[PDB]
Paper text:
Here, we report 11 lineages of V2 apex–neutralizing antibodies from simian-[name] virus (SHIV)-infected rhesus macaques and determine cryo-EM structures for 9. Envelope complex structures revealed eight different antibody classes (one multi-donor) and the complete repertoire of all five possible recognition topologies, recapitulating canonical human modes of apex insertion and C-strand hydrogen bonding. Despite this diversity in recognition, all rhesus–V2 apex antibodies were derived from reading frame two of the DH3-15*01 gene. On the negative side, to penetrate the apical glycan shield of [name] and bind underlying conserved positively charged residues, broadly neutralizing V2 apex antibodies must contain heavy chain third complementarity-determining regions (HCDR3s) that are exceptionally long, anionic, and often tyrosine sulfated.
Each lineage also recognized N156 glycan from the right-adjacent protomer (perspective from the Fab body toward [name]), but to different extents; whereas 6561-DH1020 buried 354 Å2 of N156 glycan surface area, V031-a.01 and 40591-a.01 buried only 34 and 89 Å2, respectively. Sidechain interactions included the two salt bridges formed between K170 and sulfated Y100bHCDR3 and between K171 and E100HCDR3, while W100iHCDR3 stabilized the extended aliphatic chain of K168. Like V031-a.01, the 6561-a.01 heavy chain residue D100eHCDR3 could establish an additional salt bridge with K169 from the C strand on the right-adjacent protomer. 6561-a.01 made apex hole interactions most similar to VRC26.25: sulfated residue Y100fHCDR3 was positioned to form salt bridges with [name] residue 166 from all three protomers (bottom). The relative orientation of the 6561-a.01 heavy and light chains overlapped with VRC26.25, while V031-a.01 and 40591-a.01 were rotated ∼45° and ∼180°, respectively (Data S1-Fig. 10 D). For both V031-a.01 and 6561-a.01, the germline-coded Tyr at position six was retained and bore the posttranslational sulfation.
Numbering used by the authors:
A (entry chain L): 1 to 9, 11 to 27, 27A, 28 to 54, 54A, 54B, 54C, 54D, ...
B (entry chain B): 516 to 546, 569 to 664
C (entry chain C): 517 to 546, 569 to 664
D (entry chain E): 518 to 546, 569 to 664
E (entry chain H): 1 to 35, 35A, 36 to 52, 52A, 53 to 82, 82A, 82B, 82C, ...
F (entry chain G), H (entry chain D): 33 to 139, 147 to 309, 312 to 321, 321A, 322 to 354, 356 to 408, 411 to 507
G (entry chain A): 33 to 137, 147 to 309, 312 to 321, 321A, 322 to 354, 356 to 408, 411 to 507
Amino acid sequence: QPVVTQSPSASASLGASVKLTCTLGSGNTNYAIAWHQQQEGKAPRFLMRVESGGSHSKGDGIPHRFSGSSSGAERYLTISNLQSEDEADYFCQTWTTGTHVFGVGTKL
Amino acid sequence: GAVFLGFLGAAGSTMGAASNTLTVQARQLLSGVWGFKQLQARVLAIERYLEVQQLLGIWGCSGKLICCTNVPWNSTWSNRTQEDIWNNMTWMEWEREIGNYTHTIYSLLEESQFQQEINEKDLLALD
Amino acid sequence: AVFLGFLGAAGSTMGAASNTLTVQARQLLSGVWGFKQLQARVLAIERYLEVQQLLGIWGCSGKLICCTNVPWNSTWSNRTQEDIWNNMTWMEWEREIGNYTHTIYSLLEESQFQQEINEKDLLALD
Amino acid sequence: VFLGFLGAAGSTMGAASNTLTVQARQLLSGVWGFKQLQARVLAIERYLEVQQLLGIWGCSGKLICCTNVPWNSTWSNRTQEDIWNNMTWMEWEREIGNYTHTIYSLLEESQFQQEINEKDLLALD
Amino acid sequence: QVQLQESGPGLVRPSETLSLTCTVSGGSISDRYYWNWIRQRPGKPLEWLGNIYGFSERTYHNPSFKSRVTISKDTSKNQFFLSLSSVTAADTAVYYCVRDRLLEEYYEEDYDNWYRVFDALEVWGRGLLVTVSS
Amino acid sequence: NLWVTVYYGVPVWKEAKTTLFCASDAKAYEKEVHNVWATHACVPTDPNPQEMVLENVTENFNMWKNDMVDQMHEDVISLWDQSLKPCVKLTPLCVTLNCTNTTVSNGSNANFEEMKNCSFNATTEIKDKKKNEYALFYKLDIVPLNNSSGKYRLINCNTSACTQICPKVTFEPIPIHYCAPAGYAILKCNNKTFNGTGPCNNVSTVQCTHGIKPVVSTQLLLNGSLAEKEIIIRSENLTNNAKTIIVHLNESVGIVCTRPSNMTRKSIRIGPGQTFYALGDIIGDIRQPHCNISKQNWNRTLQQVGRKLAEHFPNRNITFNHSSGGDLEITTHSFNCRGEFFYCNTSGLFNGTYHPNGTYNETAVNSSDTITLQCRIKQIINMWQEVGRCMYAPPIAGNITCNSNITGLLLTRDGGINQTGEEIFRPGGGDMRDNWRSELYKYKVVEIKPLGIAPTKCKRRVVE
Amino acid sequence: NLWVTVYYGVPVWKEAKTTLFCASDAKAYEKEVHNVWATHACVPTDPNPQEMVLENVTENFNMWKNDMVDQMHEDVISLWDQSLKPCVKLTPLCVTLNCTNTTVSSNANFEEMKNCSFNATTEIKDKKKNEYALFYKLDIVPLNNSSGKYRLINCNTSACTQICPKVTFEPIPIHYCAPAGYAILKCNNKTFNGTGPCNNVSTVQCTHGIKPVVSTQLLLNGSLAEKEIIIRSENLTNNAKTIIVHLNESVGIVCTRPSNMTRKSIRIGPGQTFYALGDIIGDIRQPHCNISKQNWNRTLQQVGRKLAEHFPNRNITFNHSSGGDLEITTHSFNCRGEFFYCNTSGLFNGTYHPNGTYNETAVNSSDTITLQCRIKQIINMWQEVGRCMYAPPIAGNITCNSNITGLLLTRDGGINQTGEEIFRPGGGDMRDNWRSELYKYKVVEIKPLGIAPTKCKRRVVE
Amino acid sequence: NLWVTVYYGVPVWKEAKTTLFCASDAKAYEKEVHNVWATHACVPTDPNPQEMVLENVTENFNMWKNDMVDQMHEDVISLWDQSLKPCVKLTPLCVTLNCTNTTVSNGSNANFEEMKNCSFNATTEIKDKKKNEYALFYKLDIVPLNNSSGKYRLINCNTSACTQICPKVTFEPIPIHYCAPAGYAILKCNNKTFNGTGPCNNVSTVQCTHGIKPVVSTQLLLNGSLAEKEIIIRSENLTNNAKTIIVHLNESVGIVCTRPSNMTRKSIRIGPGQTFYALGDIIGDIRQPHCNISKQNWNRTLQQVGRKLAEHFPNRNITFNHSSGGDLEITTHSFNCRGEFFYCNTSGLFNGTYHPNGTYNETAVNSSDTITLQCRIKQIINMWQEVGRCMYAPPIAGNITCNSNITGLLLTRDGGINQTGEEIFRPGGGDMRDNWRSELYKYKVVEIKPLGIAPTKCKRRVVE
Ligand SMILES: *[C@@H]1O[C@H](CO)[C@@H](O)[C@H](O)[C@H]1NC(C)=O
Ligand SMILES: *[C@@H]1O[C@H](CO)[C@@H](O)[C@H](O)[C@H]1NC(C)=O
């Protein structure tokens, strides 16, 4: 069960571009992740899937302004053209073969 | 005379003319998947030269290309005169006509040759 | 004769075997099985050439019976010619002088090589 | 006779003239099985190729044999004294390597000429 | 696309157990492999309770928790259930039933016995307001 | 008084059969075991070989009972089998295939039903793990397993386990020489109008053969040698309709074509250390492989061969008809083109008829008009006319274009007994030795007998 | 004043070892590579081979250290592997079997074959299809204690291939011949055993037709002796070495397998198939062998007569084999591609007393010894478990007719036992099957160089 | 007036190439096919071979273009491939491995991370049933097994089908003699200070070569033949850095080491009829392999090597450094011991520098001291630097030991163009053929031409 850590909060100015990150920590860091988004109630949404080499897997209705990258044990997510509805909780999770650990997330 | 011709040269020429070009043929004798075939081909050329040279060895013509013998020719093998033999036919027709009697002729040259040496040692044993 | 009798008159004496030299040299030289057959053919070539090489160096290139200038040594045998050619066969004679064959073979080479060098001097006088 | 293979190679021209029989004795003397089979057949080819050349030249068993072709002064300008007692077999075959083919061919024609006229001499009786 | 609609006793005054339901619209539950279940309580991060397979019925319930979760297959009428025994007052949570993505990689325990690798959660849908109070 | 003499080195030859070794030219010593024919072991012959033109001699040739072509067959089966031993086998590919129609991007609805997108179970390098993989397979290589099912399987699965051609080797038709050993000679004829059987008035001896290129075909001879004087019609028995008729043309007919698709090679792993290459996808549209034959150049060749067939079959109407049908192997002109096996129906070639009386000027036919030929690709090939071993053809990774020349035709006659008048000639690859008998027809291996005996007046000299 | 002369082509020879090539008449130009022995590559010898009997010569012989027997053994291992390489391997066959009581459309003699059903691979890899086949009791083991499932015996020692039906291993006679420069010597004394001098030595270009027959206890369809029964052994006193007995009078043997069993074609994968037993049409009858009582009694009577001189004043008794492994306990042979392992209990059931009467009128005629035995279709050969073979069945009943040639006997020789001498059969080595055939041959090398003193001298030119 | 004469048996030779055959003493008639090098087929040479010294002869030698070495390298490929075909393969072994820390009994916490206790599913004698099993494998032979893995797999699963060495046969370096057929001679130089290229003033003929042993090594040549006079430096081009330098010492340095542990030889069954062997268990304490070399022996040797390079590199400072790094195959000293393949990190051996002026007497160095060389065991080996070979070394029960000398070193030079003054020499196995170059440096194969012609005063007589 890989455990992922993240900063409790992020600070940014309105109209700028946010750079969201979450750090991966385990004995083997080769496990892939997949980002999500949690709005206020209703139902959270699935956004994209990350693998080794930055294999973008934006499945359902994702524009081309959600690029990402990896750097060692921590992966970088780049978001451009922020909007008022873009503020939410983003979760990064692992798969393995059981015990989905999920992520703490960051709230803006 | 015409010694510098090609291989098998003067094959269609007369019997007498072909006697002057007997050296061109003698030189050309003895001149994975492909390796076994080449090895078989390389081996096959050895006894082909060796089988012929065995016959010349037992006839006393070990090194001589042209040599006489002591056996007498029989008129039943060929009757035609020497003028018509050396000047009217090729080596193709001569071997074909006497191809029936080749096995018989090979026997007489042996008997004469071993006769020529046992009487020779008696001559050398007189001193 | 018409030969084709291999190893004939083996039990006859050496004197009577003087006329029985024709039937021996004639017979010589004349896939799992293919490889063994190929080995059979090359072995016969080596056996025939080994004998032929010894004949050539001794000067007996084509002579079935040939005489040499080296003399026999009494240390090898004392048997008279009457008891040699009319009393015992070829099989026993090779066994008796089998140890000395190596020394005898060396004597053949020296004498024949001597015949070439002095003949060249004789032919160089004119 | 006590000398051996390739003996007196660095010696003079005429010193090796009496040391010719020792080399002729040395002639004709599974991954490994095929190579040994190839080794044996190649040694036979080397020996028979030499023996064929001496056979057609008339020196079937002769070790030193005189011929009838004349030596050409263009091939060599050195005298007999400066050839037979000054150099070795290494350099001799090196300098006349250009003319080996011509001498082999000229000697073949002369030897065949020696037999055709000989046969006519025996036909006079 | 597929749609997931959940119904059941969201408001439970006597707290003994809890049973839930998710109707599936579009692709049948029997086909398209895995399906999942997700809890979410108001204030603490969401958790995973168990797993169900489509074809071979290989249930990967949460190894951290003991035998407290049960999944029905209900392949006959395109349905799957959820039942948890002995609900605690701290189990007041919102439940999400999930379908997974298609990464066709099949491993093997025994001869002619294959199973697919787990995948990222894909679809998700709505929710039910649950207030377990007594 | 005459006595026997012995002559050595006489020019006497006797017919015999023997083995021959390979020979080639030192065109390129580069590459690593790329050549299937293995010309590395083939000894170079001569920059200027020795040929002697014999005369006063007539020799009878019979190439229909020749050991040259039969022995040359025995090599080709050995060379092909030797080069395919260190190659992977397609045994794991015998799996259920989920096949459907191919997909084309934005940018013909009766021409794309040839290649089917297929997905199947695929074991990875660790054996006990399967992942889904997809590849493009041709229609001719799949059998739909069971009736009323959308699942297919490979055709060659149930016949015999069969392997793949390794991409590291190539089998372009490099010319090769087969050269006789010492003591054996090969006789070459030189009569221009010499058919299969007959005496040759210009027999010439050679050390051994000239450049012969091994080309496999069934209906038309490709890039072969050209005749000198005119067209010769050759047959073992012209009155027998069951024996193929070989026609040699002195005018070269040029065929040029390609398969117009740029397809990426995709590497698919099916096991530990085993990998095979299949079609990845299609870039652009889907278009069928076509081949061009010039109209003016074709019947001008067909009219000349039409006239020559009139001499052997007097006052009979001569027509050319398409193949009878049946299996795909012999019905269509099967050839090779940069490692891809083509199959083109020749229905647009053998269509017309020949009238001995009339006019056949070239200006009646318009120029710059080419005959299109529909060609189909099949990468599961069984040959030698038997269900034996496969030779799987890998993708090309590009767009191959290959230019060739038509050398001769392999024609067969119906030979109707009750039918009278019109004569129908139909192409047919009954046996594939005839693809090669058109190159060794003027060759015959002979054995040299250097022994000759004749009486003479000379007498041996006996010592006294 | 004697000098030295050289005679070329002298009749003197020296013993040596060399390779030999096969030779056989091209009786069947058809049947492409059908013969396992590969007689197609073997050159025909001669319609009338040249023979030369040598007089006034005596040569020693020793068949025990003969190189030809080893060389013949060195070939037959290679010919078998050559013909079995392009054949299908039966690795996927080694799966779980479900066998049961055989159902017939005699309740104590029908338990030799079991109706087994095993999972099989169809033309596609992923799908499997139920199939059934018949296997003998001898080829199956019950896997685990107290289980209803079985497995083949050869799935835990080596991979097993099958003999392809396209090749037939019938014993076509072949000739082993030496190259040029070598000859072989043939003895002619009818009472000549393995070691001794031969006073009628004759030379031959190469040996006569030899039938390669694999057998353990009895020699079949072989050559017959001329004078009498000849017993050859390396050391009579040593009981650890076998004893070979040659019979000059042959006795008829009739072994048959009466049953018409369908040859069913079964598939075990893509391009992989073998042949098994389909079903039984009729009654299950065990195979049997036919041996005449009077002929076998007369044979066993005379062999004890000659054995009395080698062991004087000792009683001679015949007893069955000790037991143990089935490979050497019973008499194994072949019949139309089917292997037989037959208990020879009814043959060695007697004792010879040197004093008495043994007239043949007392024995009732038309009496037959029936030899109850079974068929084993998975065979390990050459007495080492490194290779496996699978013999396909033959449709319909089969029969074979042959005449017994020799006996393979071993002596126990009890140290504390006096009087009676116990003889037991035993196939201690398989080379003995051919030592009884090559007992009159020896490879020798020819040396045509001979020298002798004489009075002649080479003339020198002056 | 002069005439041409013919001399037969003349002592003249011409350079060429030919095929050779092995030869070795029949020391052990037992141990059927137990030797990989197949010394049984090798014919014994002679109890006392014929070595004869030629005089007044000069001949050039160059082993950098010698066919003698090239034939030897081609053989070792064939000798290894012949003895590995009748062996079981490790294809069924490629399954998922559950590896965990090695458990040690009661009786080093930073050194035991070398062996892992791996468990996997292996097929029993029946294909349908599977039973779990355990085995020990080195860390160098396993990989993290890609994404979504908490388990391991073998290294060469996704490269090629990987075979196993049979335990019935052994490959100790038995010396062999390469010998020439009749008519072929092998020359032997005898000058003690003869480098790679140059005429030899003491050429001596021989029937064939002396005892040559095939030893596989990368950095240090083991148990070889010592030099006669002094250390000699051999290189094709000293100024070229890309070409290796061979150093041949006249003094041997003793290297001995063990693999200290008792390994139980466990028999495990995979597939029907295949059994391979692996490490069973641990009895005692796990200790790493280590090879010791005497301080005074190695320090003295490097001094003469440094000053010998000083003449070839005048006015330059010479220092010795460790390997560059990267792949483990060439950065370490890989050698053979009992059949277990070692990989010793050679870094402390080249731990010094040489100066032209200074004091380096032996009294300063303290005796009985040694350098410990860390080594790692790799039982799965790819040889000849090609992607299609395996030699799985089965473990041997009990600890192993070896005793060998140090004879040759393989050195490489950096040669920075901008760098001036000091220069660095590093060890590196650039070519595998270089190992046999240190034993075939004085040998050359040559033909014999017994035909000679020269003018003379004798004339052939003609009969009249
Ligand atoms: C065809 O595909 C190749 C390979 O991807 C590509 O390079 C090329 O541009 C494409 N188009 C043409 C016209 O070749
Ligand atoms: C055995 O069955 C076959 C197949 O029906 C039949 O032809 C044959 O006659 C039967 N044998 C006997 C002896 O009835």
